[PDB]
Design a protein around this ligand. Sequence first.
Ligand SMILES: CCCCC/C=C/C/C=C\CCCCCCCC(=O)O[C@H](COC(=O)CCCCCCC/C=C/C/C=C/CCCCC)COP(=O)([O-])OCC[N+](C)(C)C
Ligand SMILES: CCCCC/C=C\C/C=C/CCCCCCCC(=O)OC[C@H](COP(=O)([O-])OCC[N+](C)(C)C)OC(=O)CCCCCCC/C=C/C/C=C\CCCCC
Ligand SMILES: O=C(O)COc1ccc(Cl)cc1
Lengths: 320, 322
Amino acid sequence: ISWLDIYHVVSATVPLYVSMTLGFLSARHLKLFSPEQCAGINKFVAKFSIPLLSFQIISENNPFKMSPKLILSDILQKFLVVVVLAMVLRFWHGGKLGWVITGLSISVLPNTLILGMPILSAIYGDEAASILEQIVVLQSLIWYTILLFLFELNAARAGTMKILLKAWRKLIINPNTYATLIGIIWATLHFRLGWNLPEMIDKSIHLLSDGGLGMAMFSLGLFMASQSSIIACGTKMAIITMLLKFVLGPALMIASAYCIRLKSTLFKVAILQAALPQGVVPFVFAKEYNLHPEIISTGVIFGMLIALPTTLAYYFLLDL
Amino acid sequence: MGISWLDIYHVVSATVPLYVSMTLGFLSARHLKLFSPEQCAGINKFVAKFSIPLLSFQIISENNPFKMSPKLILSDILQKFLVVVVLAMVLRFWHGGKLGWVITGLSISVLPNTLILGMPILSAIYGDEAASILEQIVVLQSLIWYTILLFLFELNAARAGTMKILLKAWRKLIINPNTYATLIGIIWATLHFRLGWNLPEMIDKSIHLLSDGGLGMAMFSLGLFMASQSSIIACGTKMAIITMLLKFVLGPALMIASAYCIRLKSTLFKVAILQAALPQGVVPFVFAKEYNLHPEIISTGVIFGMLIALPTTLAYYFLLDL
Ligand SMILES: CCCCC/C=C/C/C=C\CCCCCCCC(=O)O[C@H](COC(=O)CCCCCCC/C=C/C/C=C/CCCCC)COP(=O)([O-])OCC[N+](C)(C)C
Ligand SMILES: CCCCC/C=C\C/C=C/CCCCCCCC(=O)OC[C@H](COP(=O)([O-])OCC[N+](C)(C)C)OC(=O)CCCCCCC/C=C/C/C=C\CCCCC
Ligand SMILES: O=C(O)COc1ccc(Cl)cc1
C-alpha cells in the first residue's frame, strides 16, 4: 500500500535489472563476449558463486529455531501441486511424468536464493529475512534433491536400485550439494557450540560470494542474450507458463497457508515468496535431461521481466 | 620492537583470502579441467570491462579532490618519471619490441597493491593517519597511471608517420570503459564534495552489485592463467628474480629519491615509501592478460610478490627509523 512504500521495492529491484541489462547488452548489441566465452562466465557463476552464496544463506539459518509450520507448509504446497498436476494431466485439459516435472519446476520452485532476499526483504524489512533462509535450505536440500531423483526416472523409465545410485553419482559432484551439506553442518555447530569462522575463512568466502547475487543476474542476461526469440514456443505455452507460476503457484500456497494456520509476518511472507520469478537451477536439469528445455526457459526469461509488475500486485493483495 | 604480533597476523589476514580465490581458479583449470582456454578469457574480459572500471569509479568518486596533498602528487609523479627514465635508459643498453618491455617495466615496478594489501598493512604499522595518505595514492593509480597505462597498451598494440598510430591508439582509448569510469568518477567527486550532491541509492547499489566480487574474479582469473603455464615460474628463474629487483629494490629506491626531492614531512615520507614496496597488484596483470603483453612475467611477480611482501615490508619499516 501507500505510495512511498512502492518506491522501496522499485529501488530494490532496479539494481537487479541494471545488472541484467548490462549482460544482455554486452552479448547482443555491444558484442563484447563471444558465445563460447559467455558459457565460461555462466559456469563460474554456477559452480563458484551460487554454491558459495548458498553457504552464506544456509549457514546463517539456526536450524534449532526453524518454524515447524513453515516447513510443513512448503511440504504441503508441493504435495497440493502434484495432486493438481496429476489430475489436470489425467484429463490433459502418455508419458505424463514428463509433463509433471515440468509443472513442479515452473510453479513451486521460485527463485528465492537470488531474488528472494533482496526484493522481499525490502518489502517487509529484516523480519522477512529468516523466513526465506528457511526456504533456501529446504529447496537446496530436499526439493532440488527430490527433483533430481525425479528427473532420473525419465532417463531410465523410457529398476529403482539402479536409479538412486545413478542419481547419487550426480549429487556427489554437484557443487551445490556440498554447500548445502557443509552449510548445515556448520550452522548446527555455530548456533549450538558457538564456533565462529576465522577471519581468513570468512573473508576467503566473501571474495567470491559477494559478487554472486549481481553476477547471477549478469549471467541471466547473458543467457537471455543466447535465446534469439524473447518468447520461444507458441504463445499458448507462454501464457500457461506465466499463469502457472504467478496464479496456480501462489494460489496453492494460500490454500496451504490457511490449512496449516500460518498467521502474521510468517503468512504474508510465505505467499509472496511463492509469487516470484522462476528459478534457473530447474532449467539446468532440463537441458541436462532434455525435458522440455525450451518450455522452462520461456518461464525464466519472461518470468524475470514480469517480476516487478507482479510482485507489487501480490504485495498489494496481501495488504487487503 | 614496534611491530606487534597482531600486525603480522593482519598482514597474513589480508593476503590469504586472495590466495584462496587464486587457488580455486588454479585447481578449476588444471586438475578439474572446467574452463577451456577461450572461456578463461571470458572471465578475464569481464574483469577488465565490468569490475575494474566500476572499482575505479568507486575509488575516484569517494575521494575528495580538494583535499589531496599536492606534495604527495608531485612525489608520485616524480617517481614514475624517474622509473621510466631508468627503464628507457637501461633497455636501450643492456646493463625487439622495447615499448612492450617499458609497459611490463612500469606494470611490475610502480603499481603496487595499495588498495587491498596496503590499507591492512600500513594501517597496522601506522595509525589511521596513514590510511588517508594511501587513499590519495590509490586514487592516483586509478585516475592517472591506469589511464596512461591503458593508452600505452593501445599505443603498443597499434604499432604491430607516428601521428596516425597515436590517433588510432587514442581512438581506442575513448571506447575503453576505464576512461569513462575515471572521467565520470572525477566529475562526480567534484560535484559530491564541492556542492553536497548525493549519489542515488539505485545508482550506488547497482554499481556495488557488479563490482563487489571484482577482486575475487581477478584472483580467480589469475589462477586460471597460471593453470596453463608449464611451471609456476613461467618466465624462468632469471626473469623471476629481475621481477623482484624491480618491485622491491628499484621501486622504493626511486620513490625515496622522489621523496627527498619533494622534501616530504615525517609521516608523509614514511607512508609514501613503504607503499611503494607493497606487493604488486592484479590490475596490471588483468590488462597484461587481455592484451597479451608478457602476462607471464607480470603474473609470477604477483604470486611470489605477496609471499615476499611481509619480509620486505618490515625490512623497510625497520630501515627508515634507524
Ligand atoms: C586459515 C586457512 C586458510 C584458508 C584455507 C581455506 C580455504 C577454504 C575457503 C574458501 C573456499 C572453499 C572451497 C570452495 C570451492 C569452490 C566451489 C567448488 O569447487 O565446488 C565444490 C566444492 O566446494 C563447494 O561445493 C562449496 C563449499 C563452500 C563451503 C564449504 C567450504 C568452506 C569451509 C567451511 C568450514 C566449515 C566446516 C564445517 C565442517 C565440514 C565437515 C565436512 C567442488 O566441485 P566443483 O565446483 O569444483 O566442480 C564440481 C563439478 N564438476 C564435477 C563438473 C567438476
Ligand atoms: C568524450 C568521449 C565521448 C563521450 C560521449 C558522451 C557520452 C557517452 C556516454 C557516457 C555514459 C557512460 C557510457 C558507458 C558506455 C561506455 C562506452 C562504450 O560504449 O563501451 C561499452 C563498454 C565496453 O566497451 P568495449 O570497448 O569493451 O566494447 C565496446 C566497443 N565495441 C562495440 C566495439 C565492442 O561496456 C560498458 O559500458 C559497461 C561496462 C562499463 C561500466 C562502467 C560504468 C562507469 C560508471 C559510469 C557512471 C555510472 C552511473 C552514473 C554516475 C552518477 C551520475 C548520475
Ligand atoms: O539458483 C537460482 O535459482 C538462481 O541462481 C542462479 C542464477 C544464474 C545461474 Cl547461471 C545459476 C543459478
